Design a protein around this nucleic acid. Structure first.
Lengths: 185, 374, 160, 185, 374
RNA sequence: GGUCAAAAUGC
RNA sequence: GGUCAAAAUGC
């Protein structure tokens, strides 16, 4: 085919509010629309989000019809000044196709590893065209893939990095006509 | 472990062969300033100075190769819209002896071509500089005087918005050089003459603006107090009387927007300009297609009864010429929607199936030939 | 001739799938088929010279036309010239992305040079404008996978 | 072919500055050019670096054209007098082809294991010659493979050892004419 | 009357073909100052800088052509009489990363040849700079670092009367480029190694002046406090144990007037220099013809019983090597009628019919290899 | 007569 | 294995 080993590419980098009042609760909440390219956040604070203008990130935002398997990676880089006997943080991860409460969860992981953790898993896009799917289109009351998170003691489990990779069998077709992507500095 | 130098291929005496790219000797850029008036020498130098103008693939091959048995190929290029026109020419002659003339009579006998860029957006001429054999050299071109004159014969019709540049691409060709010699007393056939027979200018309106051209063609061109000359005429004039078929080449030099239908025939000079009745003569009506610039005209030997004189004194009154003339007329009108004057140039390319009875002792000087602005 | 990320914008990158994907790869070759369109009035004349080189050359390089080159000219009512550069005009595959600052002295990637071989001439104010579109890469070879390089460079535009 | 099991060979051994003022920040930073053979370091301290004049290390420095798969291994040997309930150190690892900020990351690992950790991963060299690549050559604005690190509480996560191994399918050709390699003691 | 530019042959993407003359890219003149001592870098630059040194027929073709699927051909030339001799070399490697070494170990792995002008008055080397494919470019040569080192390995025997100049003629060849890649873990056959195995110097007299060379050959060359390296060794050292047939190339670098019969065999290091009895070992006696400078020597795999170690620590006492050595001896004497020392250089060209059992974790540094004046 | 143009394009 | 040398000259 066309292949290279261990070459994944960046999508997400979500950082947690610094201003967080351990009083109006313990958790912080956020979501990543893997097939849409959008980070949705809390009102808990002033969140620092960034989506990376990656070959793929770039591609999934523009390509209107998607069939195949993409590979995801979420990494927790945390607050390392916190002494390991003093860790109080879990982070509940969810995989859904809507941001609706009435929809049900596809997969559900819960990780509580001090200072850092890794999570590698497959997502597959199956749709009504010929097996092709379009981002949350009204056509077959179509959907996406969403990766939502729930952080407990967000002052500890501070940073989140989302990477994905592509499958030899990802096929697109069409152009979702999108505005200009913003490039830092 | 040793190499023999002797059996090495460092002594190849052969003519460069290759692709039009590989056989590229130079790139001359010529300047066509938008205030150009006609009769203007755009650039007169030495061929060898024209060819030595860039380092292009066979460039050193031109310089370090003693015998080139192929042909110098020019490719010119400048685009001009259809509402204007310039009439350029590339004249390659074999030597210059002094402060010489750059008319068109004097510079079009050997190998030269006229072109209106509005109609012909890319010309290609090929010539053989040693008209006497099959090979040339740069040192030949150098130490013999091969000349190239690039002149404007009939200036801009419409003055362009800014200056223009004609880029001439020079190359060595894939085709062999063939001689063209002249026995003066035993002409060939078809005899090559190439003679500027005139620059005919027809003003805008309903004027028959009748132009008569002497068919006596020895001495050449007239000048104030002098005679202008080119070999193909020199020799003709060696003879006394002549006939044959005269093949003329009518070129448009004005902007495809200046219209006229021109009527050509053959007569004598005794007729008045108000001769209703000429078109009851063998005549051929010419019309130019927008992007069409060359009409070749052939008058057969059957349009003449007896051979005519090669020279006639310059004063001989349009009432005393016993020699056939080449009349050009406006059969309609000159019409345009832009100021301009219809200008077409006539060149006697070849006399075919010639008969030359005689030997001319000579007659002093000759008459004038048309020219003028733009 | 590096063509990943797409189009540059002031502070952003512009994108279309056929580029999105290209940029998924790292290095590329093939035959590049370009489509040159006239967008000015058939009265604005020019003979344009196209070839393939590198960026280290000065604008006063007498000697380019001693490169494979193809001379284009438009017929009055002619508006499309299809241009094909063969894969034999490139020795080794090139990079799909090159940082936006990479100085015309540091590109190791092939460029597509267009020149005036004569002149622009008209009898009406106008500027000769021709648009170039890379229609298809034929007989492609893509060695690699591009992690990415932030943004891309600019592409020509302007009035009329 | 030619093969032997569990025989890898040394390349890197990076040690962290002893003089480190936990005041001008928490982290130390460093990089290893796997396909070039160079350790680039901070200005944080007086770093103790060594590259090993290994059969391979040796080979990759000399061989101008590289196609194939190499195997990497990074090992963290740390400060073991530090009591495990008292660990405050993570170390963020990155894999890039340039030392530029504008380039994007290929893979990204984050490990926070007390006193010692291991990390085994493939790198593959794909290039423009016939599929051959040359160290950061200007030819196809060519690149490498870089393994950069970020150490938090470098006084803890003290030492780093980099080993690689070769793939049955590593093919080189050409000689990068290099100065004399320095041999200790 | 118009020309189509499109159907013109200005887009030819082809490799220059022609006569050795037509396909001449450059002329480098190198200087051999008569006070030259050996190990002297006569000129170290970039190939592209070597080739861009004159305007010769395919010179622009070298510059304005993107793919050249032919080979760079060198032709060198300097004549030196028979009572003296210099030993020059042209080493073409694929890149330089810094202030690099210019030994002979370090610069002879890719494509280099040694020649004594007294014996070989004209050398010709041909190489393929992209060992990975079939075409090259100048821009390739330029932006990749192709290097050419011209060095003196064993200085003048007799100092000439004035300075000397070696003129190297550079050309593009009529023959295709063929790759030479290396799989490191699945060697080919015959494996190309090209290793300077030593500069053996035998003083004048009746001294067996016995020279022993380690057959362990990984790490490469020793340096004071360092190791010198060339890929063909880099890889060898990737393995652990090796065998095969070792093909050595013995070159004379002294003046055809310095005579010696050298005896080569294969043994171990435990033997004393006064071992009457070696020549009762398979051995081959070498003698050089006046103008003869290269003797190729082949030791068969049947001269070794078991594979040997690729590396042995540098201190390992000539009493502890369990690895086979390559002994060179004087079977007669060194004799001349001019001061000089007999010098012959040994290069392991190819290991044929190799067997590599293993994988070497490595052993720090390596031992030294002979060198010296003239 | 020479020159030139022409006997046409795409994968 | 590549390179190289070689399978030779004159009218």
């Amino acid at each position: 085919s066309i292949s290279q080993q261990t070459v994944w590419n960046q999508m997400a980098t979500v950082r947690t509010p610094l201003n967080f009042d351990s009083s109006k609760q313990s958790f912080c909440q956020f979501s990543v629309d893997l097939l849409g390219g959008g980070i949705s956040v809390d009102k808990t604070g002033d969140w620092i989000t960034l989506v990376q203008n990656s070959p793929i990130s770039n591609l999934l935002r523009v390509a209107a019809w998607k069939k195949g398997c993409l590979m995801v990676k979420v990494v927790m880089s945390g607050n390392a000044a916190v002494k390991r006997s003093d860790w109080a943080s879990l982070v509940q991860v969810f995989l859904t196709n809507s941001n609706s409460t009435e929809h049900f969860d596809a997969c559900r992981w819960t990780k509580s590893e001090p200072h850092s953790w890794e999570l590698i898993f497959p997502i597959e896009v199956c749709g009504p065209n010929n097996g092709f799917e379009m981002w949350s289109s009204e056509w077959a009351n179509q959907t996406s893939w969403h990766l939502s998170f729930l952080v407990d003691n967000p002052k500890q489990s501070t940073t989140f990095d989302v990477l994905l990779g592509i499958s030899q069998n990802f096929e697109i077709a069409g152009n979702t006509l999108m505005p200009a992507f913003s490039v830092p500095q | 472990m040793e190499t023999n130098l002797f059996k090495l291929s460092l002594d190849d005496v052969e003519t460069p062969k290759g692709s039009m790219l590989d056989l590229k000797i130079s790139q001359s850029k010529i300047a066509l300033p938008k205030n150009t008036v006609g009769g203007t020498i755009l650039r007169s130098d030495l061929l060898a100075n024209f060819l030595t103008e860039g380092n292009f693939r066979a460039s050193v091959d031109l310089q370090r190769t003693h015998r080139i048995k192929g042909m110098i190929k020019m490719v010119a290029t400048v685009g001009i819209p259809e509402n204007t026109g310039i009439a350029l020419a590339c004249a390659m002659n074999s030597s210059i002896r002094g402060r010489a003339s750059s008319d068109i009579y004097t510079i079009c006998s050997q190998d030269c071509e006229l072109w209106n860029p509005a109609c012909t957006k890319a010309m290609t001429m090929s010539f053989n500089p040693n008209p006497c054999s099959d090979a040339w050299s740069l040192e030949f071109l150098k130490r013999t005087g091969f000349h190239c004159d690039i002149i404007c014969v009939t200036g801009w019709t419409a003055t362009p918005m800014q200056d223009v540049q004609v880029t001439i691409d020079w190359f060595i060709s894939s085709q062999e050089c063939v001689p063209r010699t002249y026995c003066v007393l035993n002409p060939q056939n078809p005899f090559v003459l190439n003679r500027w027979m005139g620059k005919l200018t027809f003003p805008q309106g309903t004027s028959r603006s009748v132009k008569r051209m002497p068919l006596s063609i020895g001495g050449g061109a007239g000048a104030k107090s002098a005679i202008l000359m080119n070999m193909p005429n020199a020799v003709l004039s060696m003879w006394r009387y002549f006939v044959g078929d005269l093949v003329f080449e009518v070129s448009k030099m004005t902007s495809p927007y200046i219209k006229c239908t021109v009527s050509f025939f053959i007569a004598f000079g005794n007729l008045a300009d108000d001769t209703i009745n000429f078109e009851a003569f063998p005549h051929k009506l010419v019309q130019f297609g927008e992007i069409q610039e060359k009409v070749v005209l052939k008058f057969s030997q059957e349009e003449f009864l007896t051979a005519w004189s090669t020279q006639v004194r310059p004063a001989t009154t349009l009432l005393a010429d016993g020699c056939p003339y080449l009349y050009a007329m406006v059969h309609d009108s000159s019409v345009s929607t832009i100021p301009g004057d219809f200008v077409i140039g006539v060149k006697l390319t070849i006399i075919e199936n010639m008969c030359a009875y005689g030997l001319n002792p000579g007659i002093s000087g000759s008459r004038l030939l048309g020219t003028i602005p733009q």
